[PDB]
Design a protein around this nucleic acid. Structure first.
Ligand SMILES: [Mg+2]
Lengths: 295, 131, 415
RNA sequence: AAACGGCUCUAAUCUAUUAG
DNA sequence: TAATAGATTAGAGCCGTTTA
C-alpha cells in the first residue's frame, strides 16, 4: 500500500525526478482478468493515457507545460494523519510573468491527535517560510497571501498568522470542502450542470462547480452528477467572486495529469501528495520542495 | 429561485504567448512554453517491464487514438506536441531479478547506484513496478 | 492554381507562419512558405513570382509592424495585387493582423481596404475564422484531418448567454412547529432508557426532554410521564432560534439549532419507518428505498425506481439530513441499493459497491433528477409536500419541489 | 502507483448533554 | 471513562474512463 509513498520518500535527500509506472498501465491489454477483458480497460482513454504520461514525462524532465494567467501568493496547506503533519504548496506570479509553483515543504507538526490546525509557533514558521520564498522569488512581499485549506482556521492560529504577517499585506483564509451533499441537477437537458457556475450562499461562503459539464469537450469532467465544492472565506476579507475565480484558476495547474481541470484547487492536491511523501518515511531536513520529486 | 453567478474559465498560457482553456488543445496547437531538448529516460525494473516501457514509448511517438475523439482531444505525438525527443533507444536500464521496505530498497539502491556511479545522465527515472 | 501563399517578415515572424503553414497542411490545404518551401540554391524571387502568379488560390499577408514596411513583403504584395486584378477573384488578398501594437488605421495603403482576419489575440480563433473564410470561397485522408478541424473549431465554444433552470437536492422546509418544548422528566424518564426509541422524536438534553411534541405523547411506552405539570416544560419560539435571536444561558443558539436538526433527521427516520420503505445503514446515515413489486410497473408517475441488471436488482434510495445555515432545508443524497431476489439485501458490501458503480456507469443527470423527484413525491402524503411526524399536534413539512435555481449562462445539449 | 472523478467503508477530533 | 447527536475532518479503497 505504501510502496509509491516510501519510494518517493527515500529519493528526497538526493533530488531525483522519479515517476512510477506499473505494467498494467503501460501494457493493459496483456494482463487480463483470466476470464475475459483486461483488468484495466484503457481503450476508451488510451490517448488521454499517453497525454497524462507525456505531461508527467515532460514535467519531471524540467519542462514547463503551461503557466497561468499578480502580486498574490496562493498557499494551500493540507493536514495528514499518522499527531498531524501540515504540508503546504505555494503558487504565485513573479516579475518575469512565469508562474512559480514549487510548494512549501518541511511539514509543521501538531502533536494533537485530531486537531487539524497549526500551533502559533508552527503557523508562524510556515507563513514566514512562505513570505521568504515569495520575497526571494519576487524581491517583494505579497500584496495578498491566499491561504487556503481543506479545514477552517482557528482563531489562535489566525492571530499568529496576522502577528507574523507583514504590514500593508492582507492575507485571507479559505476552506475547500468536498463531498458536500448539494446534488444540483438540470431539469431541461440530459447532461448535468455545466462547469463554472457558482452558488453564492453568503458574502463569505459559496458553492463553486469547479467541475461539471463543459461545452468545450461536449461532456462532463466527471461521471454521474457533479458535486460542487464549498468555498468558505472563514478568515480574512475578500470578495467571494474573486475567491471563486482564484479557485477556478488554481484548478488548472494539475501538472500530474493531462485533464481540462480538476474539482479541487490543485495546490491542495499537490500539497496532499507531498504530504503523503513526507509521512511515508523518516523526516528529511530541507525537503526538495519541487513537485517533480513527489508527484 | 436563487441567482447562480458565472466565473469565466481562466486561460492557461502556452508557447508563442497564446492562451487556450484546455491544456490538451493548447499543447496540441501551440506547444509547451519552455523547450527542453529531450528526455534522458532511466528505466529501473524487470526485463519484461523494460520491454513494455520501450513498446509503449514507441507507441507514444506515433499518434494514438481515443475511442471518442471529440470529448477528449487527440495525442498527435511527443515530437508533435512538446517538441522534445524521448525515443526508446536512448533508455538507461537497471536490471532487477519489512517486505515493503526491502522491495522499496531494491529500486532505491538501484537508482542510487545508477545516479551516483553511471556516467550516463538521466533526466527522470521511470520505475516499472512488477505486477 | 491550387496553392496558398503566405508572405511575412523573415527575420522576425517565423513561428507564427510556420505554425500556420503546418496547421494548414494538417487540414489538407497545399501551402507555400519561403521559410519552409523555398528551396536552397535557387532564384528565390523568380520562384516567388512563379508561385504567386501561376499556382496560388489565396495570398495571405501577415500584418505585423515590421512585416508591413518590409521591402520583400511589399514586392510580393504588389505582384499579388497584379494577379488579383488579373484573376478577378474577390478577396484574393487576405491580410492577417497579428500584432496589437500597430493600429488598423496604420496598415499600409495597399492592404487597408481588405478586411484583415484577426490574429492579434488567440491565434486559434483567428485560424478558425480564416478556415471559415477559406471554406466560404471553396479554397482547395478524409477521416484524419476532420479531427484537427473539429479541435480548431471546438477550442472556443464559450458558454452561450442563455437562461437555464436547475433542480437541486435541497428540499426547503416550508413550515415548522411553533414551540420547541423541553419536558422536565427528572424521574419520569428512566436514566438508562434510550431517547431514540420513542415513537416521536425526542433527545435527552440536561434534565429536560428536547422535542417538538406535547408533554403527553410519550405515554404508551413511558406511562410515568402522566400528570406532569405543563409549567415545568420550557417552550421556545423556534423562529427566534432559526433567526438566531434566542441566545440565553440555558442553551446557546448553535446548540439548540443542532438539537432541532437532530430532531429533523430522526423524525425523517421515523417517518420512513412508517412510509413503507426499507432501510440500509451506510457509514453515517440511513438510506430508504422501495422494494421490487411494490410500485406499478416498478415506476412512480413516469419514472422507474427499481429495475434489474445482470441477475441483480437495483432500487433507487434516498438518505436525508437537515441543515439550517442559509435556510432551514433538508438535503438528500441518492444511492442505488442492490439485492439478489429484489427483497433480500446483500450482506456483502464490495459487490454492492461494484454493482452501484456499474449501474451508475450509464446514469446521467436526467435519470438521477427524475428518480429523486419521483421518490420524494412518492413519500409525499400531501400533493406538493411530504410529512415528518414530530408530535400529535406539531408537524414538520418538507417541500416536494427542491430549491429551484437559475443561471444566465448555459450550453447547447449534445445531440 | 498516468490521472481525475463519483461512490463506499472506517476512524478520529471539536462542541452540547447524559450516565461513570 | 462510556454514551447520543451534529459538524467537521481524516484516512483509505473500488469501478469507469464521462450519454456523441
Ligand atoms: Mg503523479
Amino acid at each position: 500500500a505504501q510502496f509509491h509513498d516510501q519510494l518517493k520518500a527515500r529519493l528526497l535527500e538526493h533530488t531525483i525526478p522519479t515517476q512510477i509506472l506499473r505494467e498494467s498501465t503501460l501494457a493493459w491489454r496483456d494482463f487480463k482478468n483470466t476470464f475475459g477483458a483486461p483488468i484495466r480497460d484503457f481503450s476508451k482513454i488510451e490517448g488521454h493515457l499517453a497525454w497524462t504520461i507525456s505531461t508527467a514525462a515532460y514535467y519531471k524532465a524540467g519542462g514547463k507545460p503551461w503557466k497561468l494567467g499578480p502580486g498574490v501568493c496562493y498557499l494551500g496547506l493540507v493536514y495528514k494523519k499518522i499527531q498531524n503533519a501540515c504540508c503546504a504548496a505555494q503558487m504565485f506570479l513573479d516579475n518575469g510573468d512565469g508562474t512559480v509553483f514549487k510548494g512549501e515543504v518541511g511539514p509543521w507538526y501538531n502533536p494533537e491527535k485530531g486537531e487539524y490546525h497549526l500551533k502559533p509557533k508552527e503557523a508562524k514558521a510556515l507563513l514566514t517560510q512562505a513570505l521568504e520564498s515569495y520575497k526571494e522569488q519576487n524581491k517583494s512581499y505579497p500584496k495578498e497571501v491566499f491561504i487556503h485549506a481543506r479545514t477552517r482556521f482557528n482563531d489562535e492560529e489566525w492571530n499568529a498568522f496576522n502577528e507574523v504577517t507583514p504590514k500593508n499585506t492582507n492575507l485571507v483564509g479559505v476552506t475547500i470542502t468536498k463531498s458536500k451533499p448539494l446534488k444540483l441537477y438540470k431539469t431541461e437537458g440530459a447532461f448535468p450542470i455545466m462547469r463554472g457556475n457558482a452558488y453564492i450562499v453568503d458574502e463569505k461562503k459559496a458553492f463553486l462547480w469547479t467541475l461539471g459539464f463543459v461545452p468545450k469537450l461536449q461532456s462532463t469532467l466527471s461521471m454521474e452528477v457533479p458535486n460542487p465544492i464549498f468555498i468558505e472565506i472563514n478568515k480574512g476579507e475578500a470578495e467571494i467572486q474573486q475567491v471563486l475565480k482564484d479557485i477556478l484558476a488554481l484548478t488548472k495547474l494539475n501538472y500530474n495529469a493531462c485533464i481540462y481541470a480538476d474539482g479541487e484547487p490543485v495546490t491542495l492536491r499537490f500539497a496532499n501528495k507531498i504530504g503523503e511523501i513526507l509521512t511515508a518515511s523518516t523526516e528529511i531536513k530541507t525537503p526538495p520542495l519541487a513537485f517533480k520529486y513527489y508527484i | 429561485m436563487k441567482e447562480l453567478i458565472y466565473i469565466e474559465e481562466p486561460s492557461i498560457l502556452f508557447a508563442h504567448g497564446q492562451k487556450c482553456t484546455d491544456p490538451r488543445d493548447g499543447l496540441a496547437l501551440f506547444g509547451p512554453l519552455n523547450q527542453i531538448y529531450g528526455i534522458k529516460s532511466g528505466v529501473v525494473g524487470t526485463q519484461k517491464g523494460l520491454q513494455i516501457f520501450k513498446s509503449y514509448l514507441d507507441k507514444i511517438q506515433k499518434p494514438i487514438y481515443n475511442h471518442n475523439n471529440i470529448t477528449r482531444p487527440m495525442f498527435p505525438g511527443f515530437e508533435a506536441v512538446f517538441g522534445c525527443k524521448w525515443e526508446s533507444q536512448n533508455i538507461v536500464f537497471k536490471e532487477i531479478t519489512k517486505r515493503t521496505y526491502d522491495l522499496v530498497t531494491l529500486f532505491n539502491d538501484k537508482i542510487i547506484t545508477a545516479n551516483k556511479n553511471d556516467e550516463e545522465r538521466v533526466d527522470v527515472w521511470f520505475v516499472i513496478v512488477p505486477e | 492554381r491550387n496553392k496558398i501563399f503566405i508572405s511575412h517578415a523573415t527575420p522576425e515572424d517565423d513561428d507564427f507562419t510556420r505554425w500556420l503553414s503546418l496547421k494548414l497542411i494538417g487540414l489538407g490545404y497545399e501551402v507555400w512558405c519561403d521559410i519552409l518551401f523555398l528551396d536552397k540554391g535557387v532564384d528565390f524571387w523568380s520562384t516567388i513570382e512563379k508561385e504567386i502568379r501561376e499556382n496560388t488560390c489565396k495570398f495571405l499577408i501577415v500584418s505585423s509592424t515590421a512585416g508591413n514596411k518590409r521591402e520583400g513583403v511589399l514586392k510580393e504584395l504588389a505582384v499579388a495585387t497584379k494577379v488579383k486584378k488579373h484573376l478577378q477573384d474577390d478577396m484574393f488578398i487576405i491580410p492577417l493582423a497579428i500584432d496589437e501594437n500597430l493600429s488598423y488605421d496604420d496598415i499600409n495603403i495597399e492592404i487597408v481596404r481588405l478586411n484583415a482576419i484577426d490574429f492579434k489575440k488567440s491565434w486559434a480563433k483567428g485560424l478558425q475564422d480564416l478556415l471559415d473564410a477559406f471554406e466560404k470561397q471553396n479554397v482547395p485522408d478524409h477521416s484524419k484531418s476532420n479531427l484537427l478541424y473539429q479541435q480548431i473549431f471546438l477550442h472556443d465554444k464559450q458558454a452561450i448567454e442563455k437562461e437555464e433552470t436547475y433542480d437541486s437536492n435541497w428540499f426547503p422546509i416550508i413550515s415548522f412547529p411553533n414551540e420547541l418544548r423541553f419536558h422536565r422528566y427528572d424521574w419520569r424518564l428512566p436514566k438508562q432508557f434510550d431517547v431514540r426509541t420513542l415513537a416521536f422524536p425526542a433527545i435527552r438534553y440536561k434534565e429536560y426532554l428536547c422535542t417538538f411534541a406535547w408533554e403527553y405523547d410519550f405515554i404508551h411506552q413511558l406511562p410515568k410521564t402522566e400528570t406532569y405539570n405543563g409549567q415545568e416544560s420550557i417552550r421556545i419560539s423556534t423562529s427566534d432560534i432559526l433567526s438566531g435571536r434566542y441566545d440565553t444561558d440555558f442553551i446557546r443558539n448553535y446548540e439548540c439549532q443542532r438539537l432541532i436538526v437532530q430532531l429533523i433527521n430522526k423524525a425523517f427516520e421515523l417517518r420512513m419507518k412508517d412510509k413503507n420503505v426499507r432501510e440500509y445503514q451506510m457509514s453515517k446515515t440511513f438510506a430508504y428505498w422501495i422494494e421490487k413489486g411494490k410500485l406499478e410497473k416498478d415506476k412512480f408517475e413516469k419514472i422507474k425506481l427499481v429495475g434489474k441488471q445482470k441477475n441483480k436488482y437495483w432500487h433507487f434510495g434516498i438518505s436525508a439530513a437537515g441543515k439550517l445555515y442559509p435556510s432551514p432545508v433538508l438535503m438528500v443524497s441518492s444511492h442505488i441499493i442492490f439485492t439478489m431476489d429484489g427483497i433480500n439485501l446483500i450482506k456483502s458490501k464490495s459487490i454492492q459497491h461494484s454493482s452501484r458503480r456499474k449501474q451508475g456507469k450509464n446514469w446521467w443527470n436526467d435519470k438521477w433528477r427524475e428518480k429523486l423527484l419521483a421518490f420524494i413525491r412518492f413519500l409525499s402524503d400531501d400533493q406538493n409536500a411530504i410529512y415528518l411526524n414530530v408530535g400529535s399536534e406539531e408537524k414538520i413539512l418538507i417541500s416536494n419541489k427542491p430549491l429551484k435555481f437559475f443561471g444566465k449562462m448555459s450550453y447547447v445539449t449534445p445531440s
